Amino acid sequence: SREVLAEKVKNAVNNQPVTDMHTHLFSPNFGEILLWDIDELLTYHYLVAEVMRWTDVSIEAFWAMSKREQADLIWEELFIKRSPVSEACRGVLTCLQGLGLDPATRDLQVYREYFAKKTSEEQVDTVLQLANVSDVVMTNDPFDDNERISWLEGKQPDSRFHAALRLDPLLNEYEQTKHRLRDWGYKVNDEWNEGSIQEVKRFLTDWIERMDPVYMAVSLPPTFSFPEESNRGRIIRDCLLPVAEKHNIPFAMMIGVKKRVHPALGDAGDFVGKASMDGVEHLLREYPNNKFLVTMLSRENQHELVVLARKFSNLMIFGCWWFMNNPEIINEMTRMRMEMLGTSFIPQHSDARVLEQLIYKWHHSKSIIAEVLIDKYDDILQAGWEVTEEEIKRDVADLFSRNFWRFVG
C-alpha cells in the first residue's frame, strides 16, 4: 500500500503546475536578457567554477573565448575527461533528455542544431510545458541599465512572468547609488533626513507602480544586522518597511552571501557565511504588519530558520538556495521543514539563469520532494489515518504554488 501511495504522490507532484517564485529569467519580449540554448546552459557560472578546478586554461583566457569555445571547453573538461556526476552537470543532461535530445551520443554539435532553429518565444512555450511551470517570478533590478530600458520603454512582461523589485544597489551600496538617484531626479541629501527619506520612498513607489512586483527583494551578507545605524538599516527602517506595509508587499531577504571573494570569477566568485538570526527575529517581531520571505545560504542556518518560522506567522521560508540546492541538502532541509512546519512553507524555487534549467531544477527537486511526501504520508497512514487523492493534490498545490500566492496576497 506504500507503492499505491507512492504512485499517487508522484502523479500529483508531477502534474501540479509550478509557480517558480524566484528566478533570473525574463519575459521573452524583454529581449536578449532571456538566456537560453545549450551554450548558455554549459556556460552557467556554476559550471565555470567547476571547470576552473580542472582546466589548465587561465581564467583570463576563458573570459576571452567566445561562448561557443567556452561551452566546448566545459563540455570536454567536465563531461568527457571526467564523468558529469556533479549536480550542475547532471542538470545539463536532464535538460537535454527532457527536450528530446540524446545524451547517449554526446554529440554537442547535434544538440546545438535543435536550438538554432527556434525563436525565444517558441522555446519558452516548450520549456514551460515540459517543466510544467505556470508562473515565473523574475528578478528585476531598476539599477541595471539594460533592464531599466525595457521598463522605461513601457514594455509589459508576458502574463506568465511576474516582476520582483530587486534592491541590492540601494540597500548595500547607498553611498554610490545615492548619486545615481540624484541624477534620476530623486533629491536625496547628504544627511539622512526627512527629505532623503521621502525621496527614497518616492523611488520605491515609482517602481512599484511601474513593475507591480509581487515582492521587493535583496541579498544580504552573513554579517547582516538589524536594527542598525547604517544606510541599509535606516533605509529598511524608514523607507522599505513603511512602503511595503502600505502596499501590502512582502519583503524577501536572501541572507548569507559574501560577495566577490574571487573577483576574477565574476558571478562564480561569491562565497557563503553563517548569519546571526537576531536581525530577522527583530524584524519579524517588531513589524507584525509586514510580511517576510526568507531563504538563507548557510547550511548551519537552516534548522534555526525553521524554528523561527514556528514562532512567526509573518515569515514564509522558501527554497534551497544556491549552495543549498544539492540533493543531500535539499533532502535534509525539506524533511526538517515538513517535520516542524507541516505544509506551511515553500520547498523550492529554481533560481534559473538560463531558460532550459527550469527542466532539471524542477525535475530534480520534485523527485526529492515526492519521496519526502511519501514518507510523511506513509507515517500517518501507518497511524491509521486515511489520505484521499484529492487531499494529496491539495497539499501538493499548497507547496508548489498556493502558499506563495496566498502569502503575497
Next chain:
Amino acid sequence: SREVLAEKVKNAVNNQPVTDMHTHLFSPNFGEILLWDIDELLTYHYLVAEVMRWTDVSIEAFWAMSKREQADLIWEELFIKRSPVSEACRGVLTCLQGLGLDPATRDLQVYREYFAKKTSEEQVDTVLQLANVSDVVMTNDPFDDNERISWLEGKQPDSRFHAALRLDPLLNEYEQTKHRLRDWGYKVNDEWNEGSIQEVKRFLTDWIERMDPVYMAVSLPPTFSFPEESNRGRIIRDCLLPVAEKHNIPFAMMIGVKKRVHPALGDAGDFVGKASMDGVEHLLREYPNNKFLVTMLSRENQHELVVLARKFSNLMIFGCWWFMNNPEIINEMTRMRMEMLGTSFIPQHSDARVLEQLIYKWHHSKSIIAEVLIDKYDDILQAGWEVTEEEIKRDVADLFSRNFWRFVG
C-alpha cells in the same frame, strides 16, 4: 540474516521497559497538574505554534477560547484543511491508534468519549502499559506556587514517578528570586557573601531532602558561560556544585533555549541558539567529582557535544531535545552518537507535557533507534562477530534504562 537480526532487535527494543528521564508529567495524586486527554494533546504548545501559521484567528482570540474550542480549531486547521504530516500532528494520531481509537473516522467527538469515562489514575495505568514505560522522571519546580503546595502538604509521588529539582528561577532570575527566598526564610543578603552562600545551600538542601530528586536541573541560554562573575555563575560555583557533590546528585543542563522571542505565544514562544562549549568543557574538567547530564537545543552543537563526551566520563549526554526531536534529526544524532560512543549514552527522553504523548514519543523514537541498532549490529556481524539475543537485550536495557540509573547512582 539481517532480517533475523532485525526481528530480534525490534523485539528487544519494543519489550524493553523504558525509564523516561525527563518529562513534564506528574504523579496522578498530585492533582490537575497532570494533563491528559485528547483536548490536551491537541492544545500542546507545539501545535499552537503550527496552527498560528495557518489560522486567521488572532493569538488573543485563541487564548480566549475554551480548551474545547482551541482543540476544535487545531483539529480543523491542521488535520482537516491540510494533511497532518508534521511530527507533532503525526504524534496525536499515533496516540489515538495506540489507545484503540480509530484515526480513520476523524471523529473527534467519539475520541473525546473515551477519555471522559476514565480517571487520571486509570489513564496513567493504561498509558504506561501501552508505552511500556516503567519509570517517569518529573520536572519539579519549587518556585511554582501550584507545585510547591503539593510538596509542602507532604504529598509523596507514585512509586513510578521520580522527582527532579528544576532551578531556572534561582539560577536565571536570582535578582527577582532572592526576594522570594527571603520571604521563605532564607536570609540571602544583597551582596554575595558567606551568608548568602549558606542560605542558598540551605534552600537546595531542604528541597533535596523533601523531594529526594534523581538530579537538579536548569535550562540555559545560547550565551551560557562558565566561570562567570554573575548570579548564575556564583550560585553554580559556590552552592550548586558543592551541594551536588556532597549528595552525589547529578547536575542536568539543557542548553540553547532563548526564552520568549514571541511572548504572545506563551510556552510556544521560545527560540534556539548555538552555544559555546567552553562553559561545559570547564565544568567537566574542573569538577571531576561532579556528574553532569547534558542535552543541547542547537543542531549545530550536537556533534561537538558527542566529542566532548569522548573526553569526559563525568558527562552523560541524553535525548533529542525539543526542536531536535524530529525523525531527520533524531536519526542523524543517534547514529553520530553510537558511532563515537557505542552504547555509553541515553538516546532519548519524551519531555511529555500531556500523559498520552508517552505513546507516540516512545513509539516514534524506538522505531528509529531500532533501525540504527540493526545497522550497527549488522556491520559487526558482517565483520564476523556473533551477537546473542541476550547481548542485544542487555545493550537495549543500557540505552533505555540502565545507563541513566547507573549514572545517577
Next chain:
Amino acid sequence: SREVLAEKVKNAVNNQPVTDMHTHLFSPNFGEILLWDIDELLTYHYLVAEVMRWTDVSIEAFWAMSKREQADLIWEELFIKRSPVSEACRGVLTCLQGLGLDPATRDLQVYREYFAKKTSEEQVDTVLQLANVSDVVMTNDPFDDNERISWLEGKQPDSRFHAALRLDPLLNEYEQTKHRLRDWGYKVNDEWNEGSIQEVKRFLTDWIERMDPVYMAVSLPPTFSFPEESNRGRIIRDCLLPVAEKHNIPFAMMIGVKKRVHPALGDAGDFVGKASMDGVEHLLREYPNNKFLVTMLSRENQHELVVLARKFSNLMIFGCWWFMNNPEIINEMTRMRMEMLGTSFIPQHSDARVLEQLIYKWHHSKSIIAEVLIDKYDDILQAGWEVTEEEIKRDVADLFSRNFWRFVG
C-alpha cells in the same frame, strides 16, 4: 541496470590501488615507531577514550598497566561487556577478519599468536596487499627526538612510504621551539628580523632536502587566523609560503583541533571547534602560486569548505578527518562534495596510527564511497548518459590516487 552499475562500481573501487595521503605510519626500516599487532589496535587512543566512559579503572592505573593488560581491559569493557558497535571497535573486528582471524571465537589469545610469529616487514607486505594500498604518506616531525634520529642517520624510507614535513612545534610553539632551533645551529634572533626569517627558511630547506616531502603540514586551532601579527602568522607569511612556492610544495592545513582539553587522556585528550574561513580564504586568494591541501575537524565547517573549493583551484580538500571519520558523517560529506565538485577532491585518508588499521579504514570508507558513486552514476544514467567501465575506473583512480599526485605535482 542499477545492479549492473553497482557491480562495476564496487569492482572498480575495490581493485583501485590506494594512495593514503595522510597517516601516522612509518617505513618498517624506521624501527619500532611503526606500530602493529592486535595489542596496538586495541590500545589505539580512540578506544582509550571509549573505555574510560565505562571502566572503573582510573586513568592513572590504566597508563600504569602493561600494553597487554590495557588491551585485555579494553577488550573486556568494549567487546565483551557491551557489543562492539562503535566505529573504532567495529574497525578492530574488520582488521581481524581481513587477516583471516575469526571474530566469532572472541579468542584474543589466539589472535595474538598470529602477530607474534611475523616480522614488521612481513606484516607490512600483508596489510598493504589486503588493504590494496600502493602508497602511504607518513607524518614526519623533525622536532621529535625519536624520528629525527632516523633521518640524521641517513635512513631512507621504503619506496612505498613518502615523507611529509609536519611543523606544529615550529608554527604553534615558536616561543619554545626557537631555543631548540638555536641549539641546532639556526641563528634565529629574539626579534623577528631578516636574520630570523632567513634561518627559519634554512631550517625548512634543510629538512625539505633531507626528507623530500610531498607537502609540509600543520594542525591548527579553531581560532586560526591569517594574516596575523603572531609567530605563526609571521612564519607562515615570511618563511613557509615563500619556501613552498620555490620548491612547488603544497601546504597542508588540518584545522579545528583544540589541544589537551583533558591532558590526562594524552593523545585521546583533544577536542574540536568550528573555525572561521577568513584565514583560509585570504591564503587561497592572496597566494595564487601556492597550493593548499585542507581538511577541517568541525562538522559545521564542512559545507562552507566545499564552497570555498569551488572558488579556488589552488585548494584541494581531502578526507573525513578524525571526529569526522564516522559513517554518518563520511556519507554526508562525500555526497555534498561530489555534488558541488564532481570528482575534483580527495574523499579520504586513513590517518592510521597502527599498521593494520589500513584494512578497516579503507574497507569502511570504500563501501561508503562506492554507494555514493553508484547513486551519482545512476542519476546521469537515468538522464540518458552512458558511462563506460573504463570511465568508471578512471574516475575511481582520480579519487583514490591521481588527484593527489597530480596536485602535489
